[PDB]
Design a protein around this ligand. Structure first.
Ligand SMILES: NCCCNC(=O)c1ccc(-c2cccc3sc(C(N)=O)cc23)s1
Lengths: 267, 8
């Protein structure tokens, strides 16, 4: 209240903020205790929402994730203080405004998202809600940042039987069997994301389409990029590429640096 | 088609 000046709302509950300390732009996320499904313990065994546990674990220094700067407990809620780049726009609004992205730009963005998801995995965190809505663009730096770990979990190599993520980005094995593994599920969602970037919208709206495993390109997409998307969207999890095989794919070579991407595509 | 957000 006194440590930060609260501004107006952004999206639903996240508000614009300024840190009184040094006038740093922040985002102030409120989470209702009554609406929290999954709880964790901190390294000092304090009972907090899983979101805070996952945010603390990924808040190393690699800035492909929106870092948690601070948090507060209140009687009926938790307040998360997150970094706020300015100017910013989420990748969903960016794609709506600009339509199907050029392959060069899609390569830069998809690469940065891959580096951010690998970072999460390296820190033992599975995001479980990778989509254009959960990616912020710093328009000056040309840096993408992952947000909203509220559907996340600790990474494990054993099967998941729960999911609170976006259904249209969820894989066939979830729709059919209520069963998935983190990595192969994440690769599926990244297939949806890449299609979404180069085609201007997600390929599937209905369960029938998700489990169908037919990918129709509504926009001109190179054969190399079509192959990567088809491979990520393989029906059988074991047939999906590893993060290694994605980043070694011919389509992913000669990526633009963030600043190159800002200069050429965002300025 | 109609492009839209999808909730979590
Ligand atoms: N059609 C216009 C919609 C406007 N909407 C927006 O611009 C934004 C909404 C919220 C934003 C945001 C900015 C900085 C940090 C974090 S963390 C976080 C989260 N949910 O965890 C969200 C954010 S950006």
């Amino acid at each position: 209240e006194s440590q930060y000046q609260v501004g107006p709302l952004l999206g639903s509950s996240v508000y614009s903020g300024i840190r009184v300390s040094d006038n740093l732009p922040v985002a102030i996320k409120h989470v209702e205790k009554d609406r929290i499904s999954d709880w964790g313990e901190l390294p000092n065994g304090t009972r907090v929402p899983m979101e805070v546990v996952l945010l603390k674990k990924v808040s190393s220094g690699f800035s492909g994730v929106i870092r948690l700067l601070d948090w507060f407990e209140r009687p009926d809620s938790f307040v998360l203080i997150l970094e706020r780049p300015e100017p910013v726009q989420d990748l969903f609004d960016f794609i709506t405004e600009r339509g199907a992205l050029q392959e060069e730009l899609a390569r830069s963005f998809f690469w940065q998202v891959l580096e951010a998801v690998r970072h999460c995995h390296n820190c033992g965190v599975l995001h479980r809600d990778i989509k254009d809505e959960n990616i912020l663009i710093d328009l000056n730096r040309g840096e993408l940042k992952l947000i909203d770990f509220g559907s996340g979990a600790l990474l494990k190599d054993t099967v998941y039987t729960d999911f609170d993520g976006t259904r249209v980005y969820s894989p066939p094995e979830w729709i059919r069997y209520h069963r998935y593994h983190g990595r192969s599920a994440a690769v599926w969602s990244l297939g949806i994301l890449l299609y979404d970037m180069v085609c201007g919208d997600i390929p599937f709206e209905h369960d029938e389409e998700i489990i169908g495993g037919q990918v129709f390109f509504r926009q001109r997409v190179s054969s190399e990029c079509q192959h990567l998307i088809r491979w990520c969207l393989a029906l059988r999890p074991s047939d999906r590429p590893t993060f290694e095989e994605i980043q070694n794919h011919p389509w992913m070579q000669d990526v633009l640096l963030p600043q190159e991407t800002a200069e050429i595509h965002l300025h | 088609r109609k492009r839209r957000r999808h909730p979590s």
